[PDB]
């Protein structure tokens, strides 16, 4: 989800929540943006490692201790 | 008898087009004029098969009844009569 | 010339990010020859990080 | 205007390796050319659909001349359910003894194709029996085709070009494609239904040259004429019928018994007439609405004109679209391309449950897979009515003609449906996960009586409604009394409960908790990807971190890295975007109906309803499970037919690994790696007098992600076809 | 009773399943010593195991076809503590929650720079803000009735 | 018969040679 | 070439004619500001479409455009 995307789109969507938002009177001083892109590949490529890392060591740990 | 059916339902929904609904008909036609694109009829605006056939429908009747309107109520007499005489061939009961 | 210093107006400039906003006015430009001089400071920034803008005189409509 | 894009004199221009790319990319889009006007656009799309309709013709005819010459068309029809269909045959100088071997399957004398289309038993019913039939066919197609072509070049001609205001004309098109392209065809195959196929179905051969010298029913015409129609209906086709012969028949040709042929467990052929012939009707009378040169009928601007709510609760109300939708082709191709959608889904919800074709419930494989590729159909289509609005917002949209008319109260409030859109997302997503992830748990941990199982009651208590007595209430047609009940049991009601309460076929299967959360993610699923499309449309035009988004274009890379970085912020990206949603949504619908069928073929449904309300029983239980067969096409000890389909899913994995290539990394490092190269083949010796004609340069980013696309979904629909054809294939049950 | 259900205090495949987890668990208590930590362990599993499917029975709840309860989330009243219920509960807390968070929102809007108190809490006036939410239905319907809860 | 054994290496091959020179030669020219 | 416009919401203060990496934009005398000096764009044949300009650039919305176009050998930036 992150690697694949850009960022404008994710801006322009936060836009009508923050209308929505302002609409009730809750919206924060703190106002919402976007991940910049360098924070959005990072996001990305760990996520992907921790999955994938964690998945070979709960496979690998589940065979050799029931094998093994 | 097919044709007693068939005859009386043309002749009454011919008297009611000619004698009841035609003025009602007539004025609502005149209130919906031809389609237009752009602002302009389409034979105006350059379609040339779009023409209206004003000789056909000009008529000798005092009132304005043409083939068309003749064709229509006809019809929906014909389709109301052929309705009648299938509901009335078989048998089936609520 | 246009709206006092330290009035509340509201902006009606569509491209603006801070559309159908108030804002304060800050100064007004004397010159006649200047298109936008009214001087405008709001709350929140932009995309970009500034906070003050330019406006014609009939963009904005005090309140 | 001299190199290969004559269409556009820019893209001549420069001399990278990009031109033929963008050359290729936009042929077809008729607007950007230069020098071009209405009437060239118009007559090169009317152009454009002669020759698809000739290429459709010729598509047929191929298809129907292979299945006749290498086909065992004859073998089949005597023995419907123990004889493989065959598509055509193969030749191959890299084929081995034994795959020449393993391939030689029914009774041909080589290796041959099994046909999983279901066309045999479609030419089956329609009533053709011997390859005559297949080859008149063929010639036929091949003609329309020809003559599809030459129409297309003729209409191209100065002197029969039609102009612009031929186009326009609605009301004479609509007119006579109510009238003449619905009603009439489905009149003239109501004749064909009546004359060949059900003679036919009874063992009587009625063809070209004596069809005039045979009696469809005895009466005649008579009855048709006289009133009396019920004569068409008295002796229906008797419960002991074999199909194909003379055997306990009758001589009805119009009925209304529904449910199921007993012995086919297909729909009567005498129904369908029926309902084709009630269809014309409806269409034949109803085509006579809109006005046209004789002087009477309805406009189209005044009935829009008309309808103004007042009180002005919807503002100027539908003033203003007539020329809205008259003067732009892409509202018309969204129009069209959402109604296409809708109908195709329509086509493959109905087409399981109610099959029309004789001997087609027992080919367990040709449903699947009909199923699967019309729901794929569906969903692209659907996705292109969307790209289509955008499109049409961005380019065809005049502000001060539409003033305060429902378009304009549409671009006024986008914000409350994009954020009504986005809690319901939001809602569907946790509640359907957190449900899931703690039945998991929950089995995980050893104890499944903790787990959270909710009933379906609403969708159970339609069902009661419809007939069905398998869960206690008793409202409308279960109960025996009831003035629906009383009302159509003397006609249809027989039929259709028997039909409906059988254990065996697919109408109305029983339903429990796990249907429940499948549905909700296909809930979630339409609702994220409407979502997407949905803001891609009504953003197109503008929005805060780009107010002027109309003049870029409809496509276009990004706007740099000011205000925080802007990628993917057109409409074209929100539609790439939205096509994954897509895939996703229609794999887990396919994934949902192949589970329940095989687990309904194969004779036990405890299996999907103990198994389907935790992920880990979908990932092992239908996964895991159904890939043993398939996994062992060929191995070390040898091979059998299933080796074909266990290539094409490794090559669908190669390509959908190979899609993230360019998905995932972006142009300059490739750039770069290009000025080495270059520099490279310039500098070495014996091969710089071969000099480049295009400087190389790498992908664009638009088209980049296009291609990435390109290959996510290919290698997802070769992969997913593969394992749905042999797993359905291996046990045949 | 209701679609086609039996309910969970006649079944049969409750006690199997019930039975069949006692007796795997006393095929594991089997190997330790009586007297023994894992043996008191398991016997305490045990009790748990048995008291959960008893008062599974005693609640009324309708096991299926294959032995597991099945929620309804129809309506019908013999099931009010089933879905409603709680689901109303929720409600309640829930509003709570957002309540709470608008207040204090509203709190820190007078002062110049409100991002300091957004991203550094303030505890006194936090806490004079969170007991307030304990009648937050009746305020809101008074806030709704008056016209303040929507911008203008 | 042997139709295949004909029809096959055409279509193939020697088509989509002739195929391929041609769009080149079309596409370098000027 | 691409394209750059200028529009007449600038106030003059010279950021995007030092931003510019090719020697495109040069800035020329005006009367309709405080600064009495706007941009403009001669050498726009020069252009690489990098978009710096446009980054540097305080107001509500920027007062210099760039619109992509018709790609060459000069705006691609090909060093062979
Ligand atoms: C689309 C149709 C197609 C067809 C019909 C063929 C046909 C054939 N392939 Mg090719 N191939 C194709 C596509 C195709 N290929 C593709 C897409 C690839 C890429 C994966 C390959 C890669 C490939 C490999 C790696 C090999 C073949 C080989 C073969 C030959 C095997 C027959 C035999 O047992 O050898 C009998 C013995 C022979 C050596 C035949 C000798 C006569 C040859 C055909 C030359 C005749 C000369 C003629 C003038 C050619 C010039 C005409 C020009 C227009 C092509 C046969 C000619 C094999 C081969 O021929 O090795 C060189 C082989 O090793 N093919
Ligand atoms: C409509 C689609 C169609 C398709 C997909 C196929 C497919 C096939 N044909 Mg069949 N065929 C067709 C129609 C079709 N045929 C027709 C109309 C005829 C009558 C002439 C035949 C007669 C035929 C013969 C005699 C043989 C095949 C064979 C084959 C196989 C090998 C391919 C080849 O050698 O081409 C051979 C093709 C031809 C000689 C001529 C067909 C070309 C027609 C005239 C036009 C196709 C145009 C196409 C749609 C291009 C449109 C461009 C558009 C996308 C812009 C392959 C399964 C071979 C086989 O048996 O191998 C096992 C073979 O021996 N076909
Ligand atoms: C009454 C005579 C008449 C007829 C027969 C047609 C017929 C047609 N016109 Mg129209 N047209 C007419 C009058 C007529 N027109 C007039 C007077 C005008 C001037 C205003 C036009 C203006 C016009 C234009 C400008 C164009 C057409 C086009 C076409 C073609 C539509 C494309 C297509 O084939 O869809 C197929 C349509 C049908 C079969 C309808 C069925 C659709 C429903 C949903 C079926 C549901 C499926 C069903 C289950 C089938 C089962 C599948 C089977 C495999 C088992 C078709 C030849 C287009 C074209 O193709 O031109 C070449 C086009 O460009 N027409
Ligand atoms: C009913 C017919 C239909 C028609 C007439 C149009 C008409 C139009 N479309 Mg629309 N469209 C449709 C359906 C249709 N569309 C559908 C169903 C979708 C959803 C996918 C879209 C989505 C869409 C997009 C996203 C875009 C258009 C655009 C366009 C315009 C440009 C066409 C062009 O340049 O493409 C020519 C395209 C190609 C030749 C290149 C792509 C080919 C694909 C990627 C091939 C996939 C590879 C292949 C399957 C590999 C197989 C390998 C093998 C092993 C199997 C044209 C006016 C374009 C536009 O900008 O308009 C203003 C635009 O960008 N359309
Ligand atoms: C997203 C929706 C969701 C829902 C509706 C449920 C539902 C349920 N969970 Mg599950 N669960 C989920 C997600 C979800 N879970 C996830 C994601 C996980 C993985 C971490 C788990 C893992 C899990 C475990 C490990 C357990 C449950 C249990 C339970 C039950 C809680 C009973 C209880 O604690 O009441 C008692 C508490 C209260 C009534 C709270 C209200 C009181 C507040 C504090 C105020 C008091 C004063 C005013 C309930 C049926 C428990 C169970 O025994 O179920 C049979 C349990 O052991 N769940
Ligand atoms: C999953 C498939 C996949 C594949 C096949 C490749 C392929 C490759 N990567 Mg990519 N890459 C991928 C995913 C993949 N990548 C992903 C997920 C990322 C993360 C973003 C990257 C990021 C990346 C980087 C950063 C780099 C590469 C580079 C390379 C190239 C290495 C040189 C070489 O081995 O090529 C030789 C070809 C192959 C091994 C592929 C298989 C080809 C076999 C032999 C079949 C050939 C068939 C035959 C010719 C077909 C003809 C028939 C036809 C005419 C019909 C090669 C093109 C490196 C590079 O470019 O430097 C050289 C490099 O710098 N890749
Ligand atoms: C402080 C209270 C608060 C309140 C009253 C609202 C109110 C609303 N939210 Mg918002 N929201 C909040 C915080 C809040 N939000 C936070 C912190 C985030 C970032 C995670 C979001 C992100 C968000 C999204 C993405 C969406 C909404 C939407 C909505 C609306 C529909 C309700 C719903 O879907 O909830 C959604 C709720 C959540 C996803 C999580 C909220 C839970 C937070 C953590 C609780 C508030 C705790 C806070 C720290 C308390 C501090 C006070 C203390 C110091 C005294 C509703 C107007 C939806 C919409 O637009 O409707 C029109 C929607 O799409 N909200
Ligand atoms: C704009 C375009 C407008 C187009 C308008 C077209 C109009 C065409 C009208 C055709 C009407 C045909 C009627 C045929 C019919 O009724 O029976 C015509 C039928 C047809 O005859 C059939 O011929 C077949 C030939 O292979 C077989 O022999 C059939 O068995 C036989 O029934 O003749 C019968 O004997 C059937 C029984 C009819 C009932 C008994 C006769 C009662 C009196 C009928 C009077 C009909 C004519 C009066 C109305 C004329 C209106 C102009
Ligand atoms: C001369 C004259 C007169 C007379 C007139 C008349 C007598 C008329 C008539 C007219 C008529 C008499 C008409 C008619 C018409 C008709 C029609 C128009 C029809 C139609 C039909 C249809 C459309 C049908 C259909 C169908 C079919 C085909 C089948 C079955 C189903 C149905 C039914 C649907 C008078 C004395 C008055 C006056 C003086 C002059
Ligand atoms: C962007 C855009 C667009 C697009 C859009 C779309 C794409 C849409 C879609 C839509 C859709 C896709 C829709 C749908 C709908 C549906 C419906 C509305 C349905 C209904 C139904 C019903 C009503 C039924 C009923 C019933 C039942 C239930 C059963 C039986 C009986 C009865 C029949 C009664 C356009 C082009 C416009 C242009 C502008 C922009
Ligand atoms: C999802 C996504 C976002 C949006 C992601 C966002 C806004 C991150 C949200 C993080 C959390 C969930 C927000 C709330 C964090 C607070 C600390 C919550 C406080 C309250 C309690 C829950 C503690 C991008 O901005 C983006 C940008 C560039 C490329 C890809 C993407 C991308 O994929
Ligand atoms: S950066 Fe913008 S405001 Fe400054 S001189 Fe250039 S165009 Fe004018
Ligand atoms: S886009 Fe870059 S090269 Fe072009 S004018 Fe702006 S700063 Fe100069």
């Known amino acids: 989800m992150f690697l694949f995307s850009g960022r404008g789109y994710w801006q322009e969507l936060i836009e009508s929540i923050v209308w929505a938002h302002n609409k009730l009177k809750v919206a924060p001083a703190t106002q919402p943006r976007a991940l910049s892109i360098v924070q959005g590949r990072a996001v990305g490529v760990t996520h992907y490692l921790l999955g994938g890392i964690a998945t070979t060591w709960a496979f690998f740990l589940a065979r050799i201790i029931a094998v093994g | 008898s097919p044709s007693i059916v068939i005859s009386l339902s043309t002749g009454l929904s011919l008297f009611l087009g000619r004698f009841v609904f035609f003025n009602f008909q007539r004025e609502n036609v005149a209130k919906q004029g031809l389609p237009e694109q752009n602002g302009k009829t389409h034979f105006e605006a350059g379609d040339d098969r779009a023409k209206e056939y004003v000789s056909l429908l000009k008529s000798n009747d005092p009132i304005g009844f043409n083939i068309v309107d003749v064709l229509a109520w006809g019809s929906i007499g014909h389709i109301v009569a052929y309705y009648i005489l299938a509901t009335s061939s078989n048998g089936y009961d609520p | 010339i246009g709206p006092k210093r330290g009035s509340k107006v509201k902006i009606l400039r569509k491209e603006s990010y801070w559309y159908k906003n108030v804002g304060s006015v800050v100064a007004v430009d004397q010159d006649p020859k200047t298109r936008y001089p009214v001087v405008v400071r709001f709350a929140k920034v932009n995309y970009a990080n500034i906070s003050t803008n330019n406006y014609a005189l009939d963009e904005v409509e005090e309140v | 205007a001299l190199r290969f894009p004559r269409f556009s004199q820019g893209l001549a221009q420069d001399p990278t390796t990009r031109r033929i790319w963008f050359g290729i990319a936009t042929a077809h889009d008729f607007e950007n050319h230069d020098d071009i006007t209405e009437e060239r656009l118009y007559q090169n799309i009317f152009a454009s659909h002669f020759g698809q309709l000739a290429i459709i013709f010729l598509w047929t005819s191929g298809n129907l001349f292979h299945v006749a010459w290498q086909g065992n068309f004859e073998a089949w029809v005597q023995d419907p359910l123990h004889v493989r269909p065959i598509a055509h045959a193969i030749w191959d100088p890299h084929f081995g003894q034994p795959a020449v071997e393993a391939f030689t399957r029914g009774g041909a004398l080589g290796p041959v194709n099994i046909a999983y289309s279901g066309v045999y038993q479609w030419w089956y019913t329609i009533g053709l029996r011997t390859n005559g039939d297949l080859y008149t066919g063929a010639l036929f197609l091949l003609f329309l085709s020809a003559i599809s072509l030459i129409a297309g070049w003729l209409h191209l001609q100065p002197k029969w070009k039609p102009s612009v205001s031929w186009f326009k004309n609605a009301e004479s098109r609509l007119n006579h494609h109510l009238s003449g392209l619905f009603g009439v065809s489905s009149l003239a195959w109501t004749g064909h239904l009546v004359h060949v196929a059900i003679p036919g179905s009874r063992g009587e051969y009625v063809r070209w040259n004596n069809f005039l010298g045979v009696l469809p029913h005895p009466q005649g015409l008579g009855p048709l004429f006289t009133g009396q129609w019920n004569l068409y209906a008295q002796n229906p086709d008797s419960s002991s019928h074999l199909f194909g012969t003379s055997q306990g028949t009758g001589t009805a040709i119009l009925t209304l018994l529904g449910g199921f042929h ?256 499948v549905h909700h993610a296909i809930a979630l699923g339409l609702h994220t990807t409407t979502l997407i499309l949905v803001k891609g449309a009504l953003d197109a035009r503008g929005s805060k971190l780009m107010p002027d988004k109309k003049d870029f274009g409809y496509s276009f890379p990004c706007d740099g890295p000011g205000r925080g970085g802007t990628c993917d912020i057109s409409a074209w990206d929100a539609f790439y975007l939205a096509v994954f949603w897509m895939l996703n949504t229609i794999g887990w619908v396919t994934f949902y109906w192949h589970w329940k069928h095989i687990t309904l073929w194969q004779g036990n449904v405890s299996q999907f309803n103990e198994s389907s309300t935790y992920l880990m029983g979908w990932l092992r239980d239908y996964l895991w499970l159904n890939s043993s067969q398939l996994i062992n096409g060929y191995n070390p000890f040898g091979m059998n037919s299933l080796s074909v389909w266990a290539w094409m899913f490794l090559f669908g994995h190669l390509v959908w690994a190979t899609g993230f290539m360019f998905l995932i990394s972006w142009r300059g490092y490739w750039q770069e790696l290009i000025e080495t190269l270059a520099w490279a083949h310039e500098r070495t010796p014996l091969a710089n007098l071969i000099r480049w004609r295009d400087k190389p340069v790498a992908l664009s980013i638009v088209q980049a992600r296009l291609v990435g696309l390109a290959h996510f979904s290919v290698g997802y629909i070769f992969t997913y076809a593969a394992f749905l054809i042999a797993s359905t294939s291996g046990k045949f049950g | 009773d209701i679609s086609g259900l039996t309910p969970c205090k006649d079944s049969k495949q409750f006690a199997k399943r019930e039975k069949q987890q006692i007796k795997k668990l006393e095929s594991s208590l089997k190997l330790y010593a009586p007297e023994s930590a894992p043996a008191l362990a398991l016997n305490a599993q045990i009790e748990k195991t048995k008291r959960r499917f008893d008062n599974y029975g005693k609640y009324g709840l309708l096991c299926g076809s294959d032995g597991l309860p099945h929620l309804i989330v129809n309506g019908d009243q013999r099931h009010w503590g089933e879905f409603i219920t709680p689901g109303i509960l929720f409600l309640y807390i829930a509003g709570w929650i957002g309540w709470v968070g608008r207040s204090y929102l509203i709190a820190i809007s007078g002062e110049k720079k409100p991002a300091m108190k957004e991203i550094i809490i303030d505890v006194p006036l936090a806490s004079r803000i969170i007991f307030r939410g304990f009648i937050w239905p009746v305020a809101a319907y008074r806030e709704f009735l008056n016209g303040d809860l929507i911008a203008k | 018969n042997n139709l295949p054994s004909i029809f096959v290496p055409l279509v193939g091959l020697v088509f989509p040679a002739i195929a391929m020179a041609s769009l080149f030669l079309h596409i370098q020219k000027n | 070439s691409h394209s750059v416009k200028i529009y007449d919401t600038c106030i003059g203060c010279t950021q995007c004619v030092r931003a510019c990496p090719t020697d495109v934009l040069e800035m020329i005398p005006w009367d309709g500001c405080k600064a009495k000096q706007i941009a403009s764009a001669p050498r726009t044949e020069d252009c690489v479409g990098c978009k710096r300009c446009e980054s540097a650039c305080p107001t509500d919305f920027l007062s210099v455009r760039v619109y992509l176009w018709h790609e060459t050998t000069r705006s691609m930036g090909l060093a062979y």
């Open chain 4, 262 to 517: 007993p012995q086919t467990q297909s729909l009567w052929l005498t129904d369908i007439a029926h309902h084709h012939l009630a269809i014309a009707i409806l269409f034949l009378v109803a085509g006579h609405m809109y006005r046209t040169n004789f002087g009477i009928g309805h406009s189209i601007k005044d009935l829009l004109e008309a309808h103004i709510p007042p009180g002005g609760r919807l503002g100027r109300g539908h003033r203003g679209l007539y020329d809205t939708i008259n003067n732009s082709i892409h509202f018309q191709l969204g129009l069209a391309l959402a109604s296409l959608g809708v109908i195709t889904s329509l086509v493959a919800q109905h087409m399981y449950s109610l099959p029309a074709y004789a001997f087609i419930a027992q080919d367990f494989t040709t449903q699947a897979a009909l199923y699967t590729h019309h729901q794929y159909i569906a969903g692209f289509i659907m996705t292109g009515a969307f790209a289509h609005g955008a499109i049409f917002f961005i380019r065809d949209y005049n502000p001060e003609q539409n003033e305060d008319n429902v378009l304009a109260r549409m671009l006024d409030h986008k914000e409350a449906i994009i954020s009504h859109l986005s809690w319901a997302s939001l809602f569907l997503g946790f509640h359907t996960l957190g449900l899931y992830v703690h039945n998991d748990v929950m089995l995980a941990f050893g104890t499944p009586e903790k787990q959270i199982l909710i009933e379906p009651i609403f969708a159970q208590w339609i069902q009661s409604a419809h007939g069905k007595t398998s869960y206690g209430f008793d409202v409308l047609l279960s109960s025996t009394n009831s003035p629906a009940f009383n009302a159509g049991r003397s006609i249809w009601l027989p039929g259709w409960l028997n039909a409906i309460n059988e254990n065996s076929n697919s109408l109305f299967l029983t339903i429990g908790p796990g249907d429940f959360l």
